[PDB]
Amino acid sequence: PKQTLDGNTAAAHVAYAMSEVATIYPITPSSPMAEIADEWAAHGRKNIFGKTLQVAEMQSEAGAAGAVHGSLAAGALTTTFTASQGLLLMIPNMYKIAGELLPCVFHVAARALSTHALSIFGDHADVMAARQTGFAMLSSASVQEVMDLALVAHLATLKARVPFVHFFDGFRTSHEVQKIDVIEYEDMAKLVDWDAIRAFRQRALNPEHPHQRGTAQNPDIYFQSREAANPYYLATPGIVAQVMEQVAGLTGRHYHLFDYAGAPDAERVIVSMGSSCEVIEETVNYLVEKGEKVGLIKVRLFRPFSAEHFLKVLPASVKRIAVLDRTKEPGSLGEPLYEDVQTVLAEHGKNILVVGGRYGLGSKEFNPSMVKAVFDNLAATTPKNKFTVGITDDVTHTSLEIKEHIDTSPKGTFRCKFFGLGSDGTVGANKNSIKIIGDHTDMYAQGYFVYDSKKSGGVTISHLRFGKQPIQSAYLIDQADLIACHNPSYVGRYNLLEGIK
Amino acid sequence: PKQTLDGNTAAAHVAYAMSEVATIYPITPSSPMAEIADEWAAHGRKNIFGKTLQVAEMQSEAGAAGAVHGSLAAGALTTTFTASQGLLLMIPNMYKIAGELLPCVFHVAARALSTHALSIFGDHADVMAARQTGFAMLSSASVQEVMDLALVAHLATLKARVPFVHFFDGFRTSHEVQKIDVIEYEDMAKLVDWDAIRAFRQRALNPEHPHQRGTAQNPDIYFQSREAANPYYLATPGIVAQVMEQVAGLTGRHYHLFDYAGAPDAERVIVSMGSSCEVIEETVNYLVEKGEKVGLIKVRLFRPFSAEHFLKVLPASVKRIAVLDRTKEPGSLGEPLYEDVQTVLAEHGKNILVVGGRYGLGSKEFNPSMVKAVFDNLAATTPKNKFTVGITDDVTHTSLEIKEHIDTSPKGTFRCKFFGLGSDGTVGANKNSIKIIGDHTDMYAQGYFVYDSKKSGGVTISHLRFGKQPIQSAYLIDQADLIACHNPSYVGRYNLLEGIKPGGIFLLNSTWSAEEMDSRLPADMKRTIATKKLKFYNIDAVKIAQEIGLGSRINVIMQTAFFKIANVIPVDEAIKYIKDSIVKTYGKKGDKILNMNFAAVDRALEALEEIKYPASWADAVDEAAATVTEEPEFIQKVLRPINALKGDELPVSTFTPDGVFPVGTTKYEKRGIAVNIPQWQPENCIQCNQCSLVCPHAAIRPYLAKPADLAGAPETFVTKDAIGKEAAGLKFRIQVSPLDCTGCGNCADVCPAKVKALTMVPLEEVTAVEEANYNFAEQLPEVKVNFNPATVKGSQFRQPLLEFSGACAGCGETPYVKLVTQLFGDRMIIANATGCSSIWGGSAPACPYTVNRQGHGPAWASSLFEDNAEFGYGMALAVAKRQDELATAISKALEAPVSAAFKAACEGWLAGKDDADRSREYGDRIKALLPGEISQASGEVKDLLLDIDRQKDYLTKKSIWIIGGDGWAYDIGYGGLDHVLASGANVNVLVLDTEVYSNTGGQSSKATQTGAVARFAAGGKFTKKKDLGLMAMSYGYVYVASVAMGASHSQLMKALIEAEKYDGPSLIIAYAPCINHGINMTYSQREAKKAVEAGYWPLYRYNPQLAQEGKNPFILDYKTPTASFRDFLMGEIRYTSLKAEQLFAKAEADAKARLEQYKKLAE
Amino acid sequence: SSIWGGSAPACPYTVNRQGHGPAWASSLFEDNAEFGYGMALAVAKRQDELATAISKALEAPVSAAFKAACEGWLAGKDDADRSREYGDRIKALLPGEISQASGEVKDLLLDIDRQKDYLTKKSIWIIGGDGWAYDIGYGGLDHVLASGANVNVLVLDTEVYSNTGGQ
Ligand SMILES: Cc1ncc(C[n+]2csc(CCOP(=O)(O)OP(=O)(O)O)c2C)c(N)n1
Ligand SMILES: Cc1ncc(C[n+]2csc(CCOP(=O)(O)OP(=O)(O)O)c2C)c(N)n1
Ligand code: SF4
Ligand code: SF4
Ligand code: SF4
Ligand SMILES: [Mg+2]
Ligand SMILES: [Mg+2]
């Protein structure tokens, strides 16, 4: 059926169905996943095993991670929800869970790490800090993809024995409300490898068929023992690809380890990950229709990085590539996705100019005008490398100049902004309006809400979209058809009518 | 000056001079840094600020990292030392320390991360997991570079405001002893940027010029604020380069961000990091001299990666590059350094074929032959990418072929190997020999020491090198000029003479004469001695030590024999240096002990005998090997080759992909290391089985048998009539396992008979007899007996499911765990924290946990040091879920057309699934009816029965046991332990309280008492012992008990059964005597008796069930002590070394206040 | 307490007329006790560096009134009231004492003036909620209390996770 959900609920919907245990510890913006899963169990929702999910809160995410390890090693399918500093505390146990080849899915609302300052907002800094744990990493770019790819990760991890991090952009996707196609629990159970679940049960710690795990090893066998898991990692791309085809036959939506969008003869291509892919594809449609030879490669399966599947969707006409990383590794030669793209192209002798940049740190806005600036830099005689987009770097001069303002929203999309007062009911009403419009029309409906740190009396700005076409606008509203001001004090204080058509 | 140090001491030397505060938490192999820094402070060593360094131990590396952050923000220069899992826990604060641009140096002895298995050994996995924190990363390749680059990091971080990780290869460099140039503290202070220090003080948190840091930021400014630190990272390469110029002018040793070595016109170049650079450069010199155009780029500054400094040292003729990473990122396109090199070369349009490989994981050997294999792969038509070196990967075929063996050791380098026994003095003497040679000659000196997993009686192999040229050989010795065997038992057991050069020296310690050599030495050893024309020397060092009065200590004797034949220095000079070291080691022992060691030197010179062997030894032929017994595949293919020191030859296809091991494999070891074993006196035995209870290795057990079963018994298998109404008509015998006994002597001390029924006799005299006795007792059939398991005697007739572990002789920990398996081992799951209990409980490839005749036994798992409570908590959730799935299928069977007896057993199980006895009774009934019930069913009903059979291993209720040491329970895992106890889950926590960190050598813990001396508490611990039991009692619904087996057997039995039957969280704090206490391990049980009698250790039981019955939950099991508290402290070295009087008085006052408080809770 | 206490760009902690007021820092959720513990060690180190320079001033040709305030401060550096009393006396005598000095004595007085912000004994306050003290940071809080350090821990017990909505 069609329902209006946010990313967190879409992920919890699938995680609840596919798991028996959930050991959790709350952290924004991932805790709504654990909260709504706790409510469903209290209301008696059954998973595909006919029972309610058991939610156990620990003293920290470190305690949660250790509990996952013990629950998995003893024979219970276990999931968890975390982000940012919480994901960091789980990293030590992630090495164990991957090392022991235990099926598992971590659902992460990717959030910035505390550096010069704390930030509750979204980027991939937390996920990138765990890219060496041996977990597989699957990125979903929209609420619909959170629904679909959460199922992919849960199905794939059972087959591959490699645990998965399924991550989606914090707030920008985790709190974005969208009308999506919801996959029935009965249909999930029809795709599960039940043989793989039973084999997982046979390996469990049990005194009636005992074993020892987690030994300490000398230099004589440790290296060999670490390489003994290579076949499982070599097989994980093909397993994910086949699981994606199962979902394709069920839903009609075709995912690949790497997806391509844009001109078949594109010469400038952006490689990106997460919700930025939505913004870029919307911009690419606008530019391709204008005659520009541009394209986009969406990274779904970040780890294991399959060179075969990346090159499979890279058009032969590509001469210049801009890679966008939603993270910062200070002092590094480049950010992770940029170094992956640079490496794979060198390993295959491709003469392609590759350039890397950073964007969207701490939920920094990333809109189509920034996407064109990235494309414009690829068209320059000397493209700027190691750049930034969305800020003005007047110290080290890394930022790209936003030359012109473009409006790439598909025509026929209604756009509304609502300026509200803290806890005056505006956000709640707009959510109900999205549900009303989504449930009773054929239109896609989208909602995103800008909050303040103050619990009472802050400014809230709701961004709502409705259209006959899928809404890929993972950015704030540019040209509003309707603007509502629910507080007379704002008149003369804020630029309410800014950008109204 | 020149001193012989290891990497850890070299690093601590600079860190101590440059720092005011050091907040630490111990972890191998980085903890020696914090230990020696604590010792220097204890003796008043001054840093460059004229003060002693303040060393503070935290509860974990997370607590250490937070303390570093706070100390830095408040204006103190602060350092720390860590590695591996410790570095992981510091990563969250590393983001903050870098984000706030605080000068700092983390010194890391790089160690592998715990994945499919724990590994204390060296690779870059830990450092690579932090490469995105914003710390700078500086790599040291040798002990000399640890000294130099530690200074570079401390100097550069003040100027750059970017904190540094200065890391060096764990063990391979941190524990490698080398003679190096040591930088004077006064010279360090002349290079320090004192303006940069003062500016750091001005930025400090201070109420007279306050500021705010660590704010929370919205999306509007967070990105810009994060990029504002770019100038500091852009400037760090130039700053590090300039500091390297300061150190160069002071020392003459020139470092660069990237250094090049090899042919100026090289076409094949290796890019690498750490001690591998030493091995590669030595190989490059050898190959370049032979005409090959090869080179090497050493990565010093890994972060920030400066493209300008990398390309400047890359020769223009390079066509092919192999990048070597000492880490593995599974599923990654490539490892980190390979991706950096590939990226930078692409950014500058270099047409260079780049290939990446992995090496040296977990201290895997990386020698010149492997280096050439990497160079040969660059010379192939199609170089293999994503390769491995040092292993045979027959599954995924990533390993490079080691074609030929090369010797790249510089000519004139002397090479020696010493095969020693655990704690026989060999390693200590070799360290002293390196100090002697380094201090008194112009030669470079190098030492590396290979240790064993066995704590007592293990094999040690020392690797020593001396030469006129710098020693870059960061690998084991291949061709030895001299080989010494300090244990004659190794003759015929290990390949001692492997790779010895023709005409080399073989020194042997044995009582065998030249004529007995023909019969005692194996044929292969005689062949090597003759063909290579070795100088064979022998010495009866034990005879010398006996006659002088030194007992069996041969360390001084064997060291004297080495210098006598090695021809490394003048023999007369060596004798003086040895006696000078004897004065330094035995000067405080007394005048009598001194002259005995002087006599050891003198007599050792005259007793060394050259063995004139016949030339016909070269033609000797191996004797026909006996018909070997058919052993299981794992024992034959895995365990034997590993114990034969051949585990490196095992290919990848040998191992499971997830680190899963079988149980019950220690019974194949049969080490036979005991000097004395208990001999049973049948006439004095009262059949009490207390000897079986206290044995730390389950080497002595009682055996019952019907008289018919004693048919094929040897004549020496003397038995006695069985005492007790349960064993009427049976025979009784106390039998010892001679090859598994350790000779500790606890069983003879516990034997309560009038005349001792167990007497210690030498093993060799009775070994042939008792082996036949044990082999018959072990094959005896099972005897159904109705002895009460709640008694000491009745529990010991149950089979021990923990046997023959690697714990020390007389260990105070294993008897507790052994007893738990005898009570509930049939149905228990163990979550074991890192520590001693995980080392003797789970060191590959042998598992001391075993199964009974039905194949049932404890399932064992170890996760981390910090997560053990939550680890077992997760197990409890899963087991409950699996029992729920089983219960659902059984309830469906009630609606199915099945036999009435099946429904009767199903209803009985459903009503008692949560009771241990009832779930087994009705569970076993269902198992007996299942094969016949399935045969009589068909269709969907047959499937319903097949689903019950699929889950029949959850009918019996399980017993979750969370086992760990006091360091886990009181410190790093206390927060998790507190939460699991508060949760109310039905888990049983067993804390083996040794009051120290026993595994890592004896560091301080919160369980350490007042006045006790341990590492990080050199002057004695001032604060009293934290009362873990008292805090757990505050919840009220937690079963808490304090036990001590040596003090009261019945109190231990009572608390264990009460804790396990309690439907809730249970905490057992067990007093575990340890070798670190400084006591005679023969009387380990007796020391626990004096502990309770002196008020040092309490015995109580807190039962929440008594509160619901209207009774007092707290029961004080020992109210009035009869022994002196001050006298118990005098019986352990850990308290006598303080003599100081103020701490003894404080310890007694705390014991009286704790005892009086327990009287208040009971009254 | 960190959201209303330290959300950029506004800081609610302020200074008095002399410009003195609480210095505020937030590290992580789990490390706050050990965080403040490290601050306590550092401040003690900074007072020791100042106290060493003041003892050298007793051995220097400086005014008798300057030596009297130094002896009073050295005797009361660990008391809040006494360290402020003699500390402010040193601050009042420093500009005139530096004016009458030269050479190494002038450098020694300038070194006192460089560290005069540690004359008054500091008061370390470790502030956090019940979620920090009872759960994620309890192990660190337990250790810092057991250490015996002179720190002041303030647990704002709301009996819930107030910031994150009430968990
Ligand atoms: C996070 C982490 N820090 C440090 C270590 C190193 N380490 C393992 S066990 C141990 C001490 C064990 O002490 P205890 O818990 O008392 O067990 P015991 O050896 O005394 O029986 C240490 C320091 C580690 N494995 N992980
Ligand atoms: C490692 C980590 N885990 C979780 C979080 C999310 N988080 C921050 S504060 C907080 C709860 C605050 O509770 P409390 O300590 O009682 O303070 P209060 O807001 O109620 O005053 C949580 C769950 C985090 N920032 N870091
Ligand atoms: S001497 Fe020690 S190891 Fe040997 S049987 Fe007796 S208690 Fe066991
Ligand atoms: S302790 Fe002595 S009396 Fe008791 S069973 Fe053992 S040998 Fe017999
Ligand atoms: S606890 Fe002590 S006696 Fe037991 S194995 Fe460890 S070091 Fe040896
Ligand atoms: Mg201990
Ligand atoms: Mg609170």
Side-chain angles (χ1 to χ4, degrees), chain A residues 25-27 61 85-86 89 111, chain C residues 29-30 129-132 136 158 160-164:
Chain A
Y25 190 77
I27 182 171
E61 294 94 337
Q85 322 295 145
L89 301 187
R111 168 186 153 183
Chain C
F29 191 25
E30 63 274 22
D130 62 286
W132 156 72
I136 186 172
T158 64
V160 290
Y161 292 5
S162 296
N163 178 41
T164 50

Side-chain angles (χ1 to χ4, degrees), chain B residues 261-295:
Chain B
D265 59 336
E267 304 169 9
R268 297 168 289 150
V269 165
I270 293 179
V271 181
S272 186
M273 193 161 55
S275 68
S276 58
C277 297
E278 293 285 278
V279 184
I280 294 164
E281 183 175 25
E282 180 184 296
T283 306
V284 159
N285 299 337
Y286 171 87
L287 298 177
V288 167
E289 193 271 347
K290 289 194 169 187
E292 298 200 19
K293 306 191 171 173
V294 299

